[PDB]
Coordinates of C-alpha atoms and ligand atoms in Angstrom, one line a residue:
Chain A
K1 CA 6.0 70.1 -84.4
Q2 CA 6.1 71.2 -80.6
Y3 CA 3.3 70.8 -78.1
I4 CA 2.7 70.5 -74.4
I5 CA 2.6 67.1 -72.8
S6 CA 1.8 67.9 -69.3
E7 CA 1.6 70.8 -66.8
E8 CA 2.4 69.8 -63.1
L9 CA 1.7 72.3 -60.3
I10 CA 4.9 73.1 -58.3
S11 CA 3.5 75.9 -56.0
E12 CA 0.3 77.9 -56.0
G13 CA 0.0 81.4 -54.3
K14 CA -3.1 83.5 -54.1
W15 CA -2.0 85.4 -57.3
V16 CA 0.8 83.5 -59.1
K17 CA 1.7 79.8 -59.5
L18 CA 4.8 77.9 -60.7
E19 CA 4.4 74.8 -62.9
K20 CA 6.6 72.1 -64.4
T21 CA 5.8 72.0 -68.1
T22 CA 6.6 68.9 -70.1
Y23 CA 6.7 69.3 -73.8
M24 CA 7.7 67.6 -77.0
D25 CA 10.7 69.1 -78.9
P26 CA 11.1 69.2 -82.6
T27 CA 13.7 66.2 -82.6
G28 CA 10.8 64.1 -81.0
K29 CA 12.5 64.4 -77.6
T30 CA 10.5 65.0 -74.3
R31 CA 11.9 68.1 -72.4
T32 CA 10.7 70.2 -69.4
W33 CA 10.4 73.9 -68.5
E34 CA 9.6 75.9 -65.4
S35 CA 6.6 78.1 -66.1
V36 CA 4.8 80.9 -64.3
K37 CA 1.2 81.7 -64.6
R38 CA -1.3 84.0 -62.9
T39 CA -4.2 82.4 -60.9
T40 CA -6.5 85.2 -61.9
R41 CA -7.3 84.4 -65.6
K42 CA -10.8 83.0 -66.2
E43 CA -12.4 83.6 -69.6
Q44 CA -10.4 86.8 -70.5
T45 CA -8.8 86.8 -73.8
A46 CA -5.7 88.0 -71.8
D47 CA -4.6 88.7 -68.3
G48 CA -4.5 92.4 -68.6
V49 CA -4.4 95.6 -70.7
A50 CA -1.8 98.3 -71.1
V51 CA -3.0 101.6 -72.5
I52 CA -1.1 103.8 -75.0
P53 CA -2.7 107.1 -74.1
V54 CA -2.2 109.9 -76.7
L55 CA -3.0 113.2 -75.1
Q56 CA -4.2 115.7 -77.8
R57 CA -4.7 119.3 -77.1
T58 CA -5.0 122.2 -79.5
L59 CA -1.7 124.1 -79.9
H60 CA 0.2 121.4 -78.0
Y61 CA 2.5 118.7 -79.2
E62 CA 0.9 115.2 -78.5
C63 CA 2.0 113.7 -75.2
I64 CA 2.2 110.0 -74.2
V65 CA 0.7 109.7 -70.7
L66 CA 2.7 107.4 -68.5
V67 CA 2.5 106.3 -64.9
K68 CA 5.1 105.9 -62.1
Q69 CA 4.5 103.4 -59.3
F70 CA 6.4 101.4 -56.8
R71 CA 6.6 97.8 -58.0
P72 CA 7.3 95.3 -55.2
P73 CA 8.8 92.6 -57.5
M74 CA 11.3 95.2 -58.7
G75 CA 11.9 96.7 -55.2
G76 CA 11.7 100.2 -56.8
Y77 CA 9.8 102.7 -58.9
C78 CA 8.9 101.9 -62.5
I79 CA 7.7 104.1 -65.4
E80 CA 4.9 102.3 -67.4
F81 CA 2.0 102.6 -69.7
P82 CA -1.2 102.7 -67.5
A83 CA -2.3 99.1 -67.1
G84 CA -4.2 96.6 -65.1
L85 CA -5.8 93.2 -65.1
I86 CA -9.1 92.6 -67.0
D87 CA -12.1 92.0 -64.6
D88 CA -14.1 88.8 -65.3
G89 CA -16.6 89.6 -68.1
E90 CA -15.0 92.9 -68.9
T91 CA -13.9 93.7 -72.5
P92 CA -10.2 94.7 -73.1
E93 CA -11.4 98.1 -74.3
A94 CA -13.6 98.7 -71.2
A95 CA -10.7 97.6 -68.9
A96 CA -8.3 100.0 -70.8
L97 CA -10.6 103.0 -70.5
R98 CA -11.4 102.2 -66.8
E99 CA -7.8 101.7 -65.8
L100 CA -6.7 104.8 -67.7
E101 CA -9.3 106.8 -65.8
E102 CA -8.4 105.2 -62.4
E103 CA -4.7 105.7 -62.8
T104 CA -4.6 109.1 -64.5
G105 CA -7.9 110.7 -64.3
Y106 CA -8.3 111.0 -68.0
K107 CA -11.3 109.9 -70.0
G108 CA -10.1 108.5 -73.2
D109 CA -11.5 107.4 -76.6
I110 CA -10.7 104.0 -78.1
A111 CA -8.5 104.1 -81.2
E112 CA -7.2 100.5 -81.6
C113 CA -6.9 97.3 -79.7
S114 CA -4.2 94.7 -80.3
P115 CA -4.5 90.9 -80.2
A116 CA -3.4 89.2 -77.0
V117 CA 0.4 89.7 -76.9
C118 CA 2.9 88.0 -74.6
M119 CA 4.7 89.7 -71.7
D120 CA 7.7 87.4 -71.2
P121 CA 7.0 84.1 -73.1
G122 CA 10.2 82.4 -72.0
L123 CA 9.0 82.7 -68.4
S124 CA 5.2 83.1 -68.2
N125 CA 2.0 82.7 -70.0
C126 CA 1.0 86.3 -69.2
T127 CA -0.7 88.2 -71.9
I128 CA -2.1 91.7 -72.5
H129 CA -4.1 93.6 -75.1
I130 CA -2.3 96.8 -75.9
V131 CA -5.0 99.4 -76.4
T132 CA -4.3 102.8 -78.1
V133 CA -6.6 105.5 -76.8
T134 CA -6.7 109.2 -77.6
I135 CA -7.4 111.7 -74.9
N136 CA -9.2 114.9 -76.0
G137 CA -7.3 117.3 -73.6
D138 CA -9.5 120.2 -74.8
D139 CA -12.6 118.6 -73.3
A140 CA -13.5 120.0 -69.9
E141 CA -13.8 116.4 -68.5
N142 CA -10.0 116.2 -68.9
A143 CA -9.2 119.6 -67.6
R144 CA -8.0 118.9 -64.0
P145 CA -8.0 115.1 -64.1
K146 CA -7.8 113.4 -60.6
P147 CA -6.6 109.8 -60.3
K148 CA -9.1 107.4 -58.5
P149 CA -6.7 104.8 -57.1
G150 CA -8.1 101.6 -55.6
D151 CA -7.0 100.2 -52.2
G152 CA -3.2 100.3 -52.1
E153 CA -2.8 101.9 -55.5
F154 CA -0.5 104.9 -55.5
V155 CA 0.2 106.3 -58.9
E156 CA 1.9 109.4 -60.2
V157 CA 1.1 110.7 -63.7
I158 CA 3.9 111.6 -66.1
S159 CA 3.0 113.1 -69.5
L160 CA 5.8 113.4 -72.0
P161 CA 6.0 114.7 -75.6
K162 CA 5.7 112.1 -78.2
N163 CA 8.2 113.9 -80.4
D164 CA 11.0 113.7 -77.7
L165 CA 9.9 110.6 -75.8
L166 CA 13.1 108.6 -75.7
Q167 CA 15.2 111.6 -74.5
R168 CA 12.8 112.6 -72.0
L169 CA 12.7 109.0 -70.5
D170 CA 16.5 109.1 -70.5
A171 CA 16.5 112.4 -68.6
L172 CA 14.1 110.9 -66.0
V173 CA 16.4 107.8 -65.6
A174 CA 19.5 110.1 -65.4
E175 CA 17.7 112.0 -62.5
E176 CA 16.6 109.2 -60.0
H177 CA 16.7 105.4 -59.4
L178 CA 13.9 104.0 -61.4
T179 CA 13.3 101.6 -64.3
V180 CA 11.5 102.3 -67.5
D181 CA 9.3 99.5 -68.8
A182 CA 10.4 97.5 -71.8
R183 CA 7.2 98.2 -73.7
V184 CA 7.5 101.9 -73.1
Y185 CA 11.2 101.9 -74.1
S186 CA 10.4 99.9 -77.2
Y187 CA 7.7 102.4 -78.3
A188 CA 10.0 105.3 -77.6
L189 CA 12.8 103.7 -79.7
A190 CA 10.5 103.1 -82.6
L191 CA 9.4 106.8 -82.5
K192 CA 13.1 107.7 -82.9
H193 CA 13.7 105.1 -85.6
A194 CA 10.8 106.3 -87.7
Chain B
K1 CA 8.1 106.7 -49.5
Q2 CA 7.8 103.0 -50.5
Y3 CA 10.3 100.2 -49.9
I4 CA 10.9 96.5 -49.4
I5 CA 11.0 95.3 -45.8
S6 CA 11.6 91.6 -46.4
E7 CA 11.1 88.7 -48.8
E8 CA 9.9 85.3 -47.9
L9 CA 10.9 82.4 -50.2
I10 CA 7.6 80.4 -51.2
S11 CA 9.2 78.1 -53.8
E12 CA 12.5 77.8 -55.7
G13 CA 13.0 75.7 -58.9
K14 CA 16.2 75.5 -60.8
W15 CA 15.4 78.5 -63.0
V16 CA 12.6 80.5 -61.3
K17 CA 11.5 81.3 -57.7
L18 CA 8.3 82.7 -56.2
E19 CA 8.6 85.0 -53.2
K20 CA 6.2 86.8 -50.9
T21 CA 7.4 90.4 -50.7
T22 CA 6.6 92.5 -47.7
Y23 CA 6.7 96.3 -48.4
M24 CA 5.7 99.6 -46.9
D25 CA 2.9 101.4 -48.6
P26 CA 3.2 105.3 -48.7
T27 CA 0.6 105.6 -45.9
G28 CA 2.8 103.6 -43.5
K29 CA 0.7 100.4 -43.8
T30 CA 2.7 97.2 -44.4
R31 CA 1.6 95.0 -47.4
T32 CA 2.4 91.8 -49.3
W33 CA 3.0 91.0 -53.0
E34 CA 3.7 87.7 -54.8
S35 CA 6.8 88.2 -56.8
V36 CA 8.7 86.1 -59.4
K37 CA 12.4 86.1 -59.9
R38 CA 14.9 84.2 -62.0
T39 CA 17.6 82.2 -60.2
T40 CA 20.1 82.9 -63.0
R41 CA 21.1 86.6 -62.5
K42 CA 24.6 87.5 -61.0
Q43 CA 24.7 91.3 -64.4
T44 CA 23.3 94.6 -65.6
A45 CA 20.0 92.7 -66.3
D46 CA 18.8 89.1 -66.9
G47 CA 18.6 89.3 -70.7
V48 CA 19.1 91.2 -73.9
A49 CA 16.6 91.6 -76.7
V50 CA 17.8 92.7 -80.0
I51 CA 16.1 95.0 -82.4
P52 CA 17.8 94.0 -85.7
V53 CA 17.5 96.3 -88.6
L54 CA 18.4 94.4 -91.8
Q55 CA 19.6 96.9 -94.4
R56 CA 20.0 95.8 -98.0
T57 CA 20.4 98.3 -100.8
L58 CA 17.4 98.6 -103.2
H59 CA 15.2 96.7 -100.7
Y60 CA 12.9 97.7 -97.9
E61 CA 14.6 97.8 -94.6
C62 CA 13.4 94.8 -92.5
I63 CA 13.2 94.0 -88.8
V64 CA 14.5 90.5 -88.2
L65 CA 12.3 88.4 -85.7
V66 CA 12.3 84.9 -84.5
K67 CA 9.5 82.4 -84.0
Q68 CA 9.9 79.7 -81.3
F69 CA 7.7 77.3 -79.3
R70 CA 7.4 78.8 -75.8
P71 CA 6.5 76.2 -73.2
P72 CA 5.0 78.8 -70.7
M73 CA 2.7 80.0 -73.5
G74 CA 1.8 76.5 -74.9
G75 CA 2.5 77.8 -78.4
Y76 CA 4.6 79.7 -80.9
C77 CA 5.6 83.3 -80.3
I78 CA 7.1 85.9 -82.6
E79 CA 9.8 87.8 -80.7
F80 CA 13.0 90.0 -81.1
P81 CA 16.0 87.8 -80.9
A82 CA 17.0 87.4 -77.3
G83 CA 18.6 85.5 -74.6
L84 CA 20.2 85.7 -71.1
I85 CA 23.5 87.5 -70.6
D86 CA 26.4 85.2 -69.7
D87 CA 28.3 85.9 -66.4
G88 CA 31.1 88.4 -67.4
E89 CA 29.5 89.2 -70.8
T90 CA 28.6 92.9 -71.7
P91 CA 25.0 93.4 -73.0
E92 CA 26.4 94.5 -76.4
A93 CA 28.4 91.3 -76.8
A94 CA 25.4 89.2 -75.6
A95 CA 23.3 90.9 -78.3
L96 CA 25.7 90.2 -81.1
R97 CA 26.1 86.7 -79.9
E98 CA 22.4 86.0 -79.5
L99 CA 21.6 87.6 -82.9
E100 CA 24.2 85.4 -84.6
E101 CA 23.1 82.2 -82.8
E102 CA 19.4 82.7 -83.4
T103 CA 19.5 84.3 -86.9
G104 CA 23.0 83.7 -88.4
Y105 CA 23.3 87.5 -88.9
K106 CA 26.4 89.5 -88.0
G107 CA 25.5 92.9 -86.8
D108 CA 26.8 96.2 -85.6
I109 CA 25.7 97.9 -82.4
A110 CA 23.7 101.1 -82.9
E111 CA 22.5 101.8 -79.4
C112 CA 21.9 100.1 -76.0
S113 CA 19.2 100.9 -73.5
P114 CA 19.5 100.9 -69.8
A115 CA 18.0 98.0 -67.9
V116 CA 14.2 98.0 -68.6
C117 CA 11.6 95.8 -66.9
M118 CA 9.8 93.0 -68.5
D119 CA 6.6 92.7 -66.3
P120 CA 7.2 94.7 -63.2
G121 CA 3.8 93.8 -61.5
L122 CA 4.9 90.2 -61.5
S123 CA 8.6 89.8 -61.8
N124 CA 11.9 91.5 -61.4
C125 CA 13.0 90.5 -64.9
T126 CA 15.0 93.1 -66.8
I127 CA 16.7 93.3 -70.2
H128 CA 18.8 95.6 -72.2
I129 CA 17.2 96.5 -75.6
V130 CA 20.0 96.6 -78.1
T131 CA 19.5 98.2 -81.5
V132 CA 21.7 96.6 -84.1
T133 CA 22.0 97.1 -87.9
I134 CA 22.8 94.4 -90.3
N135 CA 24.6 95.1 -93.5
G136 CA 22.7 92.6 -95.6
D137 CA 24.9 93.3 -98.7
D138 CA 28.1 92.1 -96.8
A139 CA 29.3 88.7 -97.8
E140 CA 29.2 87.4 -94.2
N141 CA 25.4 88.0 -94.2
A142 CA 24.8 86.5 -97.6
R143 CA 23.9 83.0 -96.4
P144 CA 23.2 83.6 -92.7
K145 CA 24.3 80.5 -90.6
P146 CA 22.1 80.2 -87.4
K147 CA 24.0 78.4 -84.6
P148 CA 21.3 77.0 -82.1
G149 CA 22.6 76.0 -78.6
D150 CA 21.2 72.7 -77.2
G151 CA 17.3 72.5 -77.3
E152 CA 16.7 75.7 -79.3
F153 CA 14.6 75.6 -82.4
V154 CA 14.3 79.0 -84.0
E155 CA 12.7 80.1 -87.3
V156 CA 13.7 83.5 -88.7
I157 CA 11.0 85.9 -90.0
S158 CA 12.0 89.2 -91.6
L159 CA 9.4 91.8 -92.1
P160 CA 9.5 95.2 -93.7
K161 CA 9.9 98.0 -91.1
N162 CA 7.6 100.3 -93.1
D163 CA 4.5 98.0 -92.8
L164 CA 5.6 96.1 -89.6
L165 CA 2.3 96.3 -87.7
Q166 CA 0.1 95.2 -90.6
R167 CA 2.4 92.3 -91.3
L168 CA 2.4 91.1 -87.7
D169 CA -1.4 91.4 -87.6
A170 CA -1.5 89.2 -90.8
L171 CA 0.7 86.5 -89.3
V172 CA -1.5 86.3 -86.2
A173 CA -4.6 86.1 -88.3
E174 CA -3.3 83.3 -90.5
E175 CA -0.8 81.3 -88.3
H176 CA -2.2 81.3 -84.7
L177 CA 0.9 82.8 -83.2
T178 CA 1.4 85.2 -80.3
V179 CA 3.3 88.4 -80.9
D180 CA 5.6 89.7 -78.2
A181 CA 4.5 92.9 -76.5
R182 CA 7.7 94.6 -77.1
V183 CA 7.6 93.7 -80.8
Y184 CA 4.0 95.0 -80.9
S185 CA 4.8 98.1 -79.1
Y186 CA 7.7 99.0 -81.4
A187 CA 5.4 98.2 -84.5
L188 CA 2.7 100.5 -83.1
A189 CA 5.1 103.4 -82.6
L190 CA 6.4 103.0 -86.1
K191 CA 2.8 103.7 -87.2
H192 CA 2.0 106.4 -84.6
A193 CA 5.2 108.4 -85.3
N194 CA 4.7 112.0 -86.7
Ligands
K1Y1 C1 15.4 72.3 -68.9 O1 15.7 73.7 -69.1 C2 14.8 74.6 -68.6 O2 13.8 74.3 -67.9 N1 15.2 75.9 -68.8 C3 14.6 77.1 -68.4 S1 13.2 77.2 -67.4 C4 13.2 78.9 -67.6 C5 12.2 79.8 -67.0 N2 14.1 79.4 -68.4 C6 15.0 78.4 -68.9 C7 16.1 78.8 -69.7 C8 16.8 80.0 -69.4 C9 17.9 80.4 -70.2 C10 18.4 79.6 -71.3 C11 17.7 78.4 -71.6 C12 16.6 78.0 -70.9
CL2 CL1 17.4 102.4 -86.7
MG3 MG1 -2.1 99.3 -62.9
MG4 MG1 -5.2 99.7 -61.7
MG5 MG1 16.4 83.3 -77.2
MG6 MG1 20.1 82.0 -78.3

């Protein structure tokens, strides 16, 4: 029933634009929306990837490897899955493995890769692939992992046990000012509810 | 170490604005970020998203989701029921209200997250994730009455919690729909648990 009629640029930055979207509603009535998009999406099946990195080590409980960074839109520190935008021509799997190494130091192994999923579909067209990766923490490659940040990347690594993830996130939030990402919280909640 | 210095308005619509954020990187170098914010917040968070667990005896437990045309995406998305929190409303009450409006179900609060970020590399948007149970055997939930506010057009899709990820993958494969990243993350963790 519903479809897009037109998309009018309102303002274009280097990285993000705002558009006036005209669409058809299911009553047959024309309506508008204010929509955000990135300027950086070319032929990628999505803007970015987020990595669900399952650190596995003999005689350890499995950990979920998370990162903490300052996020200027938020004005504060956020705890997230490692993540970044997909380079032109790069596959979602390649991007996930690369970002994971860049941000954490760890060299992972692909487990699964989602379809393109929406970040905040009432606001933006932004999409990611959510890529599950296992990290063999018994491999010597992963023994003393060093982040390789890019220019202006400043990332702290936080590994938490999968079997207590929600409580451990709650304990970090109780301890300083900082926001947990909604995807991370959602995953931690499902681990409780299962 | 890192903090906002100033924000420069680039463009303000009625519902969304784009800013150029100036911040201090941890080395002491000043840097810029393009940031999106809503104009609507006053509030613990912009929105609520509801994880609704539909419980009927002698049936599988289901997670209740909604399907809606999303103008920023140009298409239909599958999402947790959700909406913005009214000035003076609690996140709990917003959750029960949105769940009823979008689904017709009357639910009980189970738990409520802190404010969690939606896409912190891009925006300041935050939500409370509110877990709610629905007693599907109660007379009030027998014939659930969905009350859409103006211009909302919402289909209800209930899926079994025990096979959620496979069911969502099937919908995507058959229906050309976008699943929400928080829905997908939750579905992933249901599979990854234990
Ligand atoms: C003509 O109306 C719009 O453009 N509305 C927009 S634009 C946006 C980015 N959000 C809305 C919105 C927010 C809360 C509840 C309903 C809608
Ligand atoms: Cl539950
Ligand atoms: Mg990143
Ligand atoms: Mg990166
Ligand atoms: Mg809604
Ligand atoms: Mg609503």
